[PDB]
Amino acid sequence: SGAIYVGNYRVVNRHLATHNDWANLVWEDSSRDLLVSSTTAQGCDTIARCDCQTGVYYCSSRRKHYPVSFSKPSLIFVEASEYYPARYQSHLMLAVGHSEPGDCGGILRCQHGVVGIVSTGGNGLVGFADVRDLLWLDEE
């Protein structure tokens, strides 16, 4: 589990979004596994605006942060999940690391701020849904 809180926005994994998230829907992309909902309370997170390919992510199944190298956001085939059919995910970044289903929502960060959230795992890879292109998260 996990979310990003920036301005009046909450960013979550689309497959973990709550009924309240859906009732307060701002934007969702199935192909990205992202949903953004509106919040009453001001969020304190900063979104990275950069092309970093290194950062640190939180891994809840290890209670650890890991430093990783990751690929630039791309269209990647992702195997079966209990929350998706075997499908193409877009804006996905892969690193070598540990990810289990409950690690989704873990934040990947660089010096510039939040890069993305854990979205995919298995076969010793961790996949992160990028948010850096969503420039609209940093205004109204």
Q: Would you list which residues are annotated within the binding site for Zn(2+)? A: 50, 52, 110, 112
DSSP string, 6-68: EEEEEEEEGGG--HHHHHTEEEEEGGGTEEEEEEEEEEE--B--S---EEEEEETTTTEEEEE
Alpha-carbon distances of 8 from 12, 55, 68, 138, rounded to whole Å: 13, 25, 29, 10
- The interface partner of residue 48, options being ligand TJL, Zn ion, none and the CB cut-off 5 to 8 Å by kind, is Zn ion
Q: Which of 9, 57 has the CB closer to ligand TJL?
A: 57
110 part of the interface to Zn ion, by CB under 5 A: yes
Measured distance CA(127)–CA(110) in Å, rounded: 16
Q: Are 34 and 47 in contact (CB under 8 A)?
A: no
125 part of the interface to Zn ion, by CB under 5 A: no
- The interface partner of residue 112, options being Zn ion, ligand TJL, none and the CB cut-off 5 to 8 Å by kind, is Zn ion
Question: Smallest distance from the beta carbon of 14 to ligand TJL, in angstroms?
Answer: 27
26 part of the interface to Zn ion, by CB under 5 A: no
50 part of the interface to Zn ion, by CB under 5 A: yes
Is 59 part of the annotated catalytic residue set?
no
According to DSSP, the residues that pair with 130 across neighbouring strands are 116
Annotated binding site: 50, 52, 110, 112
Strands 113-120 and 107-110: antiparallel
Q: Which of 26, 110 has the CB closer to Zn ion?
A: 110
Is 138 part of the annotated catalytic residue set?
no
Is 103 part of the annotated catalytic residue set?
no
The footprint of Zn ion (CB under 5 A) covers 48, 50, 52, 110, 112
